[PDB]
Point group: C3
Chain length 96, copies 3
């Protein structure tokens, strides 16, 4: 049902360049408290790397488990991750 991927980004000055929604305090989809990518910004690290996709659920940020955290905590994890940011993500597998 899902595919998983490790994606490490080099933040640089352009920034990670994606928007997120979700968290235990405000689920973005049903009761799923996941941190979801809602938008990817042209020129940002995510866009240049090419692997991250809209709707991807971020499960881990470097060593921080963000599978079940508040939106605030997800933001803090992303902010403190530094210049080298390892994302472990989950996405829906397409119907074939």
């Amino acid at each position: 049902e899902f595919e998983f991927e490790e994606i490490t980004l080099e933040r640089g000055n352009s920034g990670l360049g994606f928007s997120i929604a979700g968290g235990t305090d405000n689920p973005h989809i049903g009761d799923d408290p996941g941190i979801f990518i809602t938008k990817i910004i042209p020129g940002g690290a995510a866009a240049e790397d090419g692997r991250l996709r809209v709707n991807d659920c971020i499960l881990r940020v470097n060593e921080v488990d963000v599978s079940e955290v508040s939106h605030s905590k997800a933001v803090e994890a992303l902010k403190e991750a530094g210049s080298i940011v390892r994302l472990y993500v989950r996405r829906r597998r397409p119907i074939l």
Copy 2:
């Protein structure tokens, strides 16, 4: 408020090539248990045909009514539909 469309796809080896979310067991939007297209994969049948759109709600798969089913049942309907897959879909009409 809505537009409806019949779209029949020829699966071939590329596959239908779209992701879905939703169902009675896990509504993708509010209490709407609809089966929604969340992504369309380049090279797939859906993309090549061109008619199916992200956010389209699949109401019927061949002769199977998927208006109110579990996600599992929607998947099973799509899997068993064979090579010729008739989708009856609903989408929001745009504000003009």
Copy 3:
């Protein structure tokens, strides 16, 4: 966390050309009753203007506060706005 923007569209004959979802009667995201842009139609005023983005939350339509209204009321506000339609919108700021 958010960015705000004023966007005024000239409706013309092409129409505003965007789809919306949400409202107090049927929240599109969690308990957020916001009116959200779900799609932007090529050739429409929104697309030609270029500023409006999918996921943008419409807070105001000319002088009508649509921050907390039914979907029906949001539609009525957009319909009665005439040819010159001032939208005040909110969107998520991206992670940098």
